[PDB]
């Protein structure tokens, strides 16, 4: 089964979202708070999720039959997936346009004489926005020059609408009949991305002036580590790239067997994730160093720090290889495959999580997938407009920020403190052949929550306004973003209150029906609750 651990560790979050986060934070100084969070609270909250899903064969919302008070955490990890699906599909819509626009002998992003070119373009033969490759993305693809801000936003663009419809149709017809959407599409996302990355890495070392871009990647500065921004960016990116906190792992583990080894599958994914991220950063910074001996400017003053860094970088590196059309086609085919697989995984996670709860949607899958996909298309229509990059930035900043860390922290607290690390270890020993040990028990009970809470608190206290590289957002945009962020975090206490007023009895007999497994129904009456003695809470 050593193909899924290779075909799933890389997705559209290590080749798109990691480059610009590494570039913005400096490069190198971003890998110190990345490995720490991967070792401390990235592997344990992958092993725990896999074990929970494999033992309790339920989705991401009804798995909380071991502690009914915490069922709101299951509902709080579906809205985040919905938002991520919206802007994920919007972003995938660009790769189709770039692939279709590359079936020529002279690529559009190499010349400075096309219709969409302003009378300020400069051909070398904050950010410089007049370069031929960065002007294409801004004008002939996004049409950003017709929007004055987030308060203007024109009508949707008719050229990306067709690509969005194509992506929506592909997703629907992929997830319309069966859950097995992984046994025939893992032979393109497991081999091609590695080949393309290797070619790019082996080419980006002979470029003139490419040593100055790798002498800054392997150079640690100690003044960016005293500010609480990289510590939050790395913490969010770890959970974005690993899959924890979205409910995907539980849903995809509930369909496996009862003798699978989660230990090996958890230790064989983080290593590949780290290696892929390091290699991607190396290649990206090599290309950035190359694009400084041409414009004769500094490394920090080239390119953007937004979502278009890869679309500005990679087309400017394909043009140097011999046979540019072939490599462009291969690269964008790989991007399309990665995006489609990730979107399919997320949508399947949402659908399974919602269908395991209500049994009426389990018999109607074609009428439910259509509804989910149509809602996603309608709510993703916003980012296709003229000023859609502003909405994309707002969603990227606020959809999964503090909310995902809060959800993961609540998951860890509910699984450990209120259930029992002893009970979890006994279940794992019943399923597999061994016991979790001591490192994982000490990590999942004391160390991981102590870091997640610190990150959440320091992110709440140290909040900075929202900008896009030249544009300070209006003040009400921050209010809207915080409302979006709180829309997921507010679901945890609401379910607690509802379940407290829903049951019948006294306070002692109402608090005792939400801290015990649902199958131990005839134990509360005989006053047999193990959570009322210190021996349960004194077990490390
Ligand atoms: O068994 C298994 C299954 C499995 C899947 C994965 C991929 C993790 N990725 C998936 C996409 N991600 C989304 N979260 S929400 C959302 C909404 C729309 C589109 C994408 C998304 C981010 C995390 C990994 Cl790395 C290991 C394993 N192991």
Q: Measured between alpha carbons, how far is 364 from 377 in angstroms, rounded to an integer?
A: 20
Between the CA atoms of 116, 119, 120 and 122, what dihedral angle is there, to the nearest 10 degrees?
Answer: 80
Q: What are the binding residues for (R)-noradrenaline?
A: 11, 23-24, 81, 85, 240, 305
Way the structure was solved: cryo-EM
Secondary structure of residue 480 in the 3-state scheme: helix
- Give the residue among 124, 153, 121, 159 at the shortest CA–CA distance from 140: 159
User: Which residues lie below 8 Å from residue 493, measured CB to CB, with a gap of 6+?
Assistant: 72
Angle formed by the axes of helices 475-489 and 388-398, nearest 10°: 40
- Give the residue among 385, 348, 329, 391 at the shortest CA–CA distance from 181: 348
CA 441 to centroid of ligand 1, rounded, Å: 25
- Give the residue among 245, 235, 225, 239 at the shortest CA–CA distance from 456: 235
User: Which residue has its alpha carbon closest to ligand 1 atom 16?
Assistant: 346
Q: Which of 18, 243, 251 is the best mutation target for the ligand 1 pocket, counting ligand atoms within 8 Å of the beta carbon and taking the most?
A: 243
Q: Are 332 and 98 in contact (CB under 8 A)?
A: yes
Q: What are the binding residues for Na(+)?
A: 7, 9-10, 14, 241, 273, 341-342
| Tokens describing residue 50 | 């896999």
Three-state DSSP string of 196-221: HHHHHHHHCCCCCCCHHHHCCCCCCC
Q: Are 418 and 67 in contact (CB under 8 A)?
A: yes
What DSSP character marks residue 467? Answer: B
Q: Measured between alpha carbons, how far is 233 from 3 in angstroms, rounded to an integer?
A: 30
Secondary structure of residue 233 in the 3-state scheme: helix
| Tokens describing residue 9 | 């560790």
- Give the residue among 234, 172, 330, 252 at the shortest CA–CA distance from 42: 234
Secondary structure of residue 361 in the 3-state scheme: coil
CA 342 to centroid of ligand 1, rounded, Å: 6
CA 303 to centroid of ligand 1, rounded, Å: 29
245-266 exposure pattern, b = at least 16 Cβ within 10 A, e = fewer? bbbbbbbbbbeeeeebebbebb
User: Which residues lie below 8 Å from residue 378, measured CB to CB, with a gap of 6+?
Assistant: none
Q: Are 214 and 289 in contact (CB under 8 A)?
A: yes
User: Which residues lie below 8 Å from residue 143, measured CB to CB, with a gap of 6+?
Assistant: 157, 386
Could you give the angle at the alpha carbon of 2 between the alpha carbons of 332 and 425, nearest 5°? 120
Query: Atom of ligand 1 at shortest distance to CA of 243?
Result: 23
CA 91 to centroid of ligand 1, rounded, Å: 16
Secondary structure of residue 309 in the 3-state scheme: helix
User: What's the CATH fold of domain 4-502?
Assistant: Amino acid/polyamine transporter I (1.20.1740)
Give the C-alpha distances (Å, rounded to integers) separating 203 from 283, 295, 321: 9, 20, 8
Q: Are 249 and 317 in contact (CB under 8 A)?
A: no
Q: Are 74 and 353 in contact (CB under 8 A)?
A: yes
CA 340 to centroid of ligand 1, rounded, Å: 11
Q: Measured between alpha carbons, how far is 382 from 153 in angstroms, rounded to an integer?
A: 9
Q: Measured between alpha carbons, how far is 174 from 183 in angstroms, rounded to an integer?
A: 12
Q: Which of 42, 237, 345, 347 is the best mutation target for the ligand 1 pocket, counting ligand atoms within 8 Å of the beta carbon and taking the most?
A: 345
User: Which residue has its alpha carbon closest to ligand 1 atom 13?
Assistant: 346
CA 174 to centroid of ligand 1, rounded, Å: 16
Residues framing ligand 1 (Cβ under 6 A) = 8-9, 11, 13, 81, 84-85, 88, 240, 242-243, 246, 248-249, 252-253, 269, 342-343, 345-346
User: Which residue has its alpha carbon closest to ligand 1 atom 9?
Assistant: 243
Neighbours of 181 (CB within 10 A): 16
Secondary structure of residue 156 in the 3-state scheme: strand
Q: Measured between alpha carbons, how far is 302 from 122 in angstroms, rounded to an integer?
A: 14
Q: What are the binding residues for dopamine?
A: 11, 81, 240, 305
User: Which residue has its alpha carbon closest to ligand 1 atom 21?
Assistant: 346
Neighbours of 183 (CB within 10 A): 9
- Give the residue among 419, 444, 454, 452 at the shortest CA–CA distance from 45: 444
- Render 375-406 in DSSP notation, one character per residue: HHHHHHGGGGBTTHHHHHHHHHHHTTSHHHHH
Domain map (residue ranges) of the chain: 4-502
Q: Measured between alpha carbons, how far is 298 from 289 in angstroms, rounded to an integer?
A: 9
CA 172 to centroid of ligand 1, rounded, Å: 18
Query: Atom of ligand 1 at shortest distance to CA of 273?
Result: 25
Three-state DSSP string of 249-274: HHHHHCCCCCCCCHHHHHHHHHHHHH
Q: Which residue has the tokens 């694009």?
A: 291
Chain centroid offset of residue 87 CA: 11
User: Which residue has its alpha carbon closest to ligand 1 atom 23?
Assistant: 243
Angle formed by the axes of helices 366-380 and 79-100, nearest 10°: 70
């Amino acid at each position: 089964f050593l193909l899924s651990v290779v075909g799933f560790a890389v997705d559209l979050a290590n080749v798109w979202r990691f480059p610009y986060l590494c570039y913005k934070n400096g490069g190198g100084a971003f890998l110190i708070p990345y490995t720490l969070f991967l070792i401390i609270a990235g592997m344990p909250l992958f092993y725990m999720e896999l074990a929970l899903g494999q033992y309790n064969r339920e989705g991401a919302a009804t798995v909380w039959k071991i502690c009914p008070f915490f069922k709101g955490v299951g509902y709080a990890v579906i809205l985040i997936a919905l938002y991520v699906g919206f802007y994920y599909n919007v972003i995938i819509a660009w790769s189709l346009y770039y692939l279709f626009s590359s079936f020529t002998l002279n690529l559009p992003w190499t010349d400075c004489g096309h219709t969409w070119n302003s009378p300020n373009c400069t051909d070398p033969k904050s950010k410089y926005k007049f370069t031929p490759a960065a002007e294409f993305y801004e004008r002939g693809v996004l049409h950003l020059h017709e929007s004055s801000g987030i308060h203007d936003i024109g009508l949707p663009q008719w050229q990306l609408l067709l690509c969005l419809m194509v992506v929506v149709i592909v997703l629907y017809f992929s997830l319309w009949k069966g859950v097995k959407t992984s046994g025939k599409v893992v032979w393109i996302t497991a081999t091609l991305p590695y080949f393309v990355l290797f070619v790019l890495l082996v080419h980006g070392v002979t470029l003139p002036g490419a040593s100055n871009g790798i002498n800054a990647y392997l150079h640690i500065d100690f003044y960016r580590l005293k500010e609480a921004t990289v510590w939050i960016d790395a913490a969010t990116q770890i959970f974005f790239s690993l899959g924890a906190g979205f409910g995907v792992l539980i849903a995809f583990a509930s369909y496996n067997k009862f003798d699978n080894n989660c230990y090996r599958d958890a230790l064989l994914t983080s290593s590949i994730n780290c290696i892929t991220s390091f290699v991607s950063g190396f290649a990206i910074f090599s290309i950035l160093g190359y694009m400084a001996h041409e414009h004769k400017v500094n490394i920090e003053d080239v390119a953007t720090e937004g979502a278009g860094l890869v679309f500005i970088l990679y087309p400017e590196a394909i043009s140097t290889l011999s046979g540019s059309t072939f490599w462009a086609v291969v690269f964008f085919v790989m991007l399309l495959a990665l995006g489609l697989d990730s979107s399919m995984g997320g949508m399947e996670a949402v659908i399974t999580g919602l269908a395991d709860d209500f049994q009426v949607l389990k018999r109607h899958r074609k009428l439910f997938t259509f509804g989910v996909t149509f809602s996603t298309f309608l709510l993703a229509l916003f980012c296709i407009t003229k000023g859609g990059i502003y909405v994309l930035t707002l969603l990227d900043t606020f959809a999964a920020g503090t909310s995902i860390l809060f959800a993961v922290l609540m998951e860890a607290i509910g699984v450990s403190w209120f259930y029992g690390v002893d009970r979890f270890s006994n279940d794992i020993q019943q399923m597999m052949g061994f016991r979790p040990g001591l490192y994982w028990r000490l990590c999942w009970k004391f160390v991981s929550p102590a870091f997640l809470l610190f990150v959440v608190v320091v992110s709440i206290i140290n909040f900075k306004p929202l900008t896009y590289d030249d544009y300070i957002f209006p003040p009400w945009a921050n209010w809207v973003g915080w409302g979006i962020a709180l829309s997921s975090m507010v679901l945890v206490p609401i379910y607690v209150i509802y379940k407290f007023l829903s049951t019948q009895g006294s306070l002692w007999e109402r608090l005792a029906y939400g801290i015990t497994p649902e199958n131990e129904h005839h134990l509360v009456a005989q006053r047999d609750i193990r959570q009322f003695q210190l021996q349960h809470w004194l077990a490390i």
